[PDB]
RNA sequence: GAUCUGGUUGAUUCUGCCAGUAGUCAUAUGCUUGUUUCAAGGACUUAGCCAUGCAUGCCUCAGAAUCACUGCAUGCAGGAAUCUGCGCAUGGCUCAUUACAUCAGACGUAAUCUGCCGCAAAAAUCUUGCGGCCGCAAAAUUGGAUAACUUGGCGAAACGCCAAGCUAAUACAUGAACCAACCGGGUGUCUCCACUGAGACGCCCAGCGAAUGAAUGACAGUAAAACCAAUGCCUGCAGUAACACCCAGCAGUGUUGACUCAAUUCAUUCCGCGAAAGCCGGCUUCCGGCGUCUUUUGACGAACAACUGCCCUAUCAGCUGGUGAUGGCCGUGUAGUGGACUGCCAUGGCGUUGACGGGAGCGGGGGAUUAGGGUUCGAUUCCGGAGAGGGAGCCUGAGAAAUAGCUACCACUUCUACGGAGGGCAGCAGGCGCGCAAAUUGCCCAAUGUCAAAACAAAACGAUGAGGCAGCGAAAAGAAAUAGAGUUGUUUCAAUGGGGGAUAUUUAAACCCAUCCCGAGUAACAAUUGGAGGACAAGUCUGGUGCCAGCACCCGCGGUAAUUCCAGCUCCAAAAGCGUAUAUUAAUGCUGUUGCUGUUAAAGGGUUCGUAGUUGAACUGUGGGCUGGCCCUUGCAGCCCGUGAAAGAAACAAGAAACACGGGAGUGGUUGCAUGUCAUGCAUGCCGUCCGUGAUUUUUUACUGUGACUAAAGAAGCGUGACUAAAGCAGUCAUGACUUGAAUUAGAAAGCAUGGGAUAACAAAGGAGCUUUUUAAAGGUAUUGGAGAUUAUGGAGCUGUGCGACAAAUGCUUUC
RNA sequence: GGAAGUCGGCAAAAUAGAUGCGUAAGUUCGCAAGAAGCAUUGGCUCUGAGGGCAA
């Protein structure tokens, strides 16, 4: 995904975007999902960056998963 | 808390008819999983013909007539499966359950050397108490002192009389194997290559006697011989070759026209 | 009774979530033991598949280590120093995990000697032991005076225990500055 | 079957609606109905209210009988009754709630709990008898209490109760030394060496499981040699798993993608753990079936989490907000993760890609209709969820926030001697209401299952309104009577069912079907329901009525000569069925993606600017040469496959190249003589790959081809003369065989592996932030027997000097 | 008991400070508004926050 915000103190939300398919229209339409990831001090991401998450534990009330690799 | 079965729910193998009951017996917690396994009841009342209906197979099987790896077993719901003996001793019949090639359970008969022993595929390995090294059987069986050399994917050859291991057979690129599950379940092969995808299920590309390709999951393997040429346990008697179903519907419309 | 389901909470829309089933025994909670400082008394609570928990009402006595000599004594409990939760918990002396206390340090001493040789038969071990071997010196200016600080590393509303290790390094200094 | 017809005008050609027409396991109502097979059946409205009866219990050879119980002669049993152990959290019913909830496909628990079932494990413990704390011995002959029962009873009753006396255990409590091992930690008296070291001896303490603390839970970037002290082996460094004797190989080696996990050692601390102190059987012993405590792993479950999808509404645009809203820190609580919760801190999280609010709805598998694309239904058999009048709370238990369990309040309601005591059909039958709208207060455990103290049988039959069977039943679906054949100008001939019975058959018992006989000539054993101007098949018929009565889905008939009303006759359509009403699919290219219209029929905004959004120009790109005068068809083979340049250098290849790993490869992949002998050494030898780890740098998504993984029932269809068929999965042929059969396919989207590069998408950039190799020199880990220290010499990188060789996509013998 | 008294609630009773939450129709958009209404408050022993100038 793509970094969206890092206004929260180690912590991020980001974004994945997709295309959804209609079968009755034969045709494509944008959708897009938010997630918040747990960050770690080893990495420094930016907004507009892509990131590598991978699922864990529950950490919070909304936080399931966490950075492992900044592109 | 589930305790009751119902008849359309049942598995497909057992091979029981949508308008003759609403219930099934239920399986009990065993050797063999629920979706796996064919209870006694059914192999004794179907299948074999014995018993006429419940009432017989009860009288048949808690007398202790009937029993399985060297044991009478007393429960019409007891889960038996993949490679398990069966021995009726008034009777004197000897069967040991498999997979044709169109994945159904049949039972081969066997003789009385070869109902001594059965194939037993490792699942686990742990240490318990006293640092004693375990392994876990894909029939719920725990070894207590397995061969230094035994790993997750290998096969146990297991006297049943004397309780002892015999021999080992490893998982590695040029041994045959049966499949245990899926779409090819019940077709012999040999291992060509294994993908491994750390994280996920490896898979494996196999190859058949007459050179056609399948793969499975790592998962649904059985090694049961060190090539398509020397197996360790006697099979079905297709052995394991799947048929093109154009070409099979043919013969059995010829053989149908000779027999009358 | 207390639930610890989601089900009450808002959803990060704002919105009310619409319950449609009643409380189950599953998510139950229970109520907090707050641990005391006295004679032992505890109350025993049984737990879901029939385990039983221990609910401690009043603990004095505790197991405490020093963990660069890798042992261990029984010793008696005599005060609360400091709380991060906050020093309510300290007025009212409460114990918890993670809390820092005052233990006796008899115990401590004695077995420095008989290990050592040194006050704070033919085979002289001691000597052998003694070497590349050094003490620091907040440690010892404790153990002159009575007392030493501890810090609590089991959950007395859990296991019924008070069980914990003793404050040496940078975490001894860290709260000696905040008592201060 | 990829189909249309009537109605706007004096005539015509359009747009456009109204009407006609065919289905519905789709409901209700009207008129009719001989035979047989297969079936739905109080969901819609009132998750409204309920008289009565029944729906969950269990005993074997194998847990407890002194019934003042019963036979028969000391052993039995319907052994009544009670205590004990297991179950009653399943099944059955219903659809009220419900939109980041539930559910479907696909996944996780390394965040947890788990009775019954399978395979396993077990060396802690000072007990008993006798004699006088000690001594002698060993098949440890352990203790107290309660039911049933008896006596006295209380109360109008109550699935209400009191006191006393007896007595069982597989209920409860207590409790076992020596036989009987291996291994370790801490400490005192004796011998010896040296001037410390070794061995006794004593003395402690060392089981499973739980808690805290400390170690282990490997290695896998460089190699030759000195110097000290302590050790090993030779008579100075060869040889060399480790270890001061009883053991000279009695673990130097757990698992995973990954672990603070498995397991082991040390210190301190629990303060749950019987060999049931059990029961039968077979032969003085021996052997065999059960039963139970603790520990540990499979299986069967439970609980939690969420990747993609999931109706209408803007005359609903802002929502949440330390008052928990988003996140952080230390805690608490839980079986466990977590704002789940307390304290303190920061200011976040969501929204036109539709938040928040409102409305109608349980979600799927699937049903109806359809050339294709679609539209619509799904209370209801299987799977998931939720509830038991409403609402909360809880005990027991492995599992319940249980309701044919308990507690309270609210609304209804039953009995009473007035003191008090009870109730919960959305289980099966039934009843009242409500309505357009839906069965018998029946028989049985024979089959299918569930429970369990339990094969069956024998004095000797477990329960089961789950489930099955029949009764009622034109919802719907198959097959099918109401005759047939003849001779002359109205008279004969056979045949058969409906029906009535059977030595019988079926069935748990009955019933139905099937099999077989006394029986048809108005074969009275008698067919109906709608119509006859047009749409739309079928009358200039005959009477009656006279814009009245009436018909008519629409257009229209009826005012004294009615093709249309009321009747008779005769004809038409479907036929054991046929009309009417209301919904819904097609008809409908009248919702249009495929596929509609917008000058005048309804419809382009008065004109511009502009943000999300949709859409967006070209280009990096003919491979060539030889066989069967260019170009093109074929079949061949082989090419550094433009040009350079012959082990290296050009081009590629992170799927690759560099490093290293004997705990890498079933023993280290492929191309009777020695070593040891104190030996279970019973031993040991006669170039491409595989596997682990480090260093070095880069391409997805999307589309498309395969493959994997994916409950039945339902749909498609392979075989099969249940007499055919709707069905079903069976059956067929000569002390049995067919090594019988039950094939196969499709199922949205999302998720998984792989190969293909044309059309495209994402991201980056905005072009001045843009050399290699070879020798000489100066400066600053590993091997020496192993273990601990000090030490030079070198490897390698860091750099500043000279030298040799070769490139350069832009001329330095150059430009200014 | 609570306006029945009286021409008439005249007179009397009644409300009440401070702080938090909350607040209708109408409207000249300023108000209406202290609209209406709900809750807390003593004493004692503690804890936190809010500063200056001297190295
Ligand atoms: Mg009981
Ligand atoms: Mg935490
Ligand atoms: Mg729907
Ligand atoms: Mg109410
Ligand atoms: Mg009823
Ligand atoms: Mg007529
Ligand atoms: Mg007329
Ligand atoms: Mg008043
Ligand atoms: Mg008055
Ligand atoms: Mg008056
Ligand atoms: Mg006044
Ligand atoms: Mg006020």
Redesign the pocket.
């Known amino acids: 995904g ?1 970094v ?10 980001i ?22 990831v ?1 960050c770690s001090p080893a990495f420094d991401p930016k907004q ?1 960056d ?1 990131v590598v998450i ?12 966490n950075v492992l690799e900044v592109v | ?12 193998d057992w ?23 064919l209870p006694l ?2 192999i004794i ?3 074999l013909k014995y018993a ?13 007539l009937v029993h399985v ?1 060297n ?9 038996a499966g993949f490679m398990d003996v069966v021995e009726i001793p008034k009777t004197g019949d000897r069967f040991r359950l498999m997979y ?5 359970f ?1 039972l081969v ?1 066997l003789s009385e050397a070869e109902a001594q022993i059965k194939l037993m595929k490792v ?12 392994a ?9 002192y397995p ?8 096969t146990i050859v297991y006297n049943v009389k004397e ?1 002892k291991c015999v ?4 998982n ?1 690129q040029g ?1 045959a194997v049966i ?1 245990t ?5 019940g077709r012999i092969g040999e291992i060509v290559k294994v ?9 494996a590309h196999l190859k058949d006697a007459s050179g056609a ?5 790592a998962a ?1 393997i059985f ?1 049961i011989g ?1 090539d398509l040429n020397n197996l360790q346990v006697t099979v ?3 052995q394991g070759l ?2 093109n ?1 154009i070409q ?2 043919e013969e ?2 010829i ?2 026209e000779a ?2 | ?35 005391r400082l006295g004679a ?1 008394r ?1 109350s ?12 401690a009402l009043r603990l004095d006595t505790g ?6 000599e ?5 010793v008696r409990l005599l005060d609360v120093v400091y ?7 300290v ?1 009212t002396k409460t ?5 820092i206390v005052a233990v006796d340090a008899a115990p401590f001493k004695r077995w420095y000697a ?2 050592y040789g040194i006050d704070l ?8 032991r003694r070497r590349n071997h050094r003490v620091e010196k907040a440690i010892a200016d404790q153990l002159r005076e009575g007392r030493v600080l501890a810090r ?10 008070a ?3 003793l404050l040496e390094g940078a975490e001894l200094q860290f709260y000696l500055k905040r008592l201060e």
């Open positions: 793509v969206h915000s890092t206004k929260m103190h180690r912590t991020i939300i974004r994945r975007n997709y295309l959804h398919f209609i079968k009755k229209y034969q045709r494509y339409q944008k959708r897009h999902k938010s997630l918040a747990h507009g892509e991978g699922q864990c534990r529950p950490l919070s009330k909304t936080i399931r998963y | 808390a589930k305790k009751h079965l119902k008849r359309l729910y049942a598995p497909k091979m029981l008819s949508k308008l003759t009951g609403v219930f099934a017996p239920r399986p009990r917690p065993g050797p063999h999983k629920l979706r796996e396994c009841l059914v009342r179907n299948r006429l209906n419940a009432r017989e197979g009860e009288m048949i099987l808690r007398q202790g790896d044991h009478p077993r007393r429960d019409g719901k007891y889960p044709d090639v169109k994945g159904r049949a008969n699942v686990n390995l742990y240490t318990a108490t006293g640092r004693v090294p375990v876990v059987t894909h029939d719920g069986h725990r070894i207590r061969d230094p050399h035994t790993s997750i994917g290998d309780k021999d080992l057979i490893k590695r041994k499949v599950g899926g779409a090819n379940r993908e491994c995808h750390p994280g996920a299920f490896n898979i390709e399948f793969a499975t999951r649904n090694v060190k079905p008697k297709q799947r048929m179903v099979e519907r059995r419309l053989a149908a027999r009358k | 009774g207390i639930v610890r389901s989601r089900l009450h909470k808002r959803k990060i829309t704002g919105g009310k979530t619409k319950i449609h089933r009643k409380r189950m025994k599953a998510e139950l909670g229970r109520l907090p033991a707050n641990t032992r505890v025993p609570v049984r737990a879901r598949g029939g385990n039983f928990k221990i609910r197991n405490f280590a020093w963990a660069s890798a042992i261990a004594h029984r709380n991060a939760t906050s020093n309510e918990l007025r114990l918890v995990k993670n809390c008989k290990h038969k033919l085979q002289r071990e001691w000597t052998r609590i590393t089991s959950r007395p509303g859990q296991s019924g225990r069980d914990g290790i």
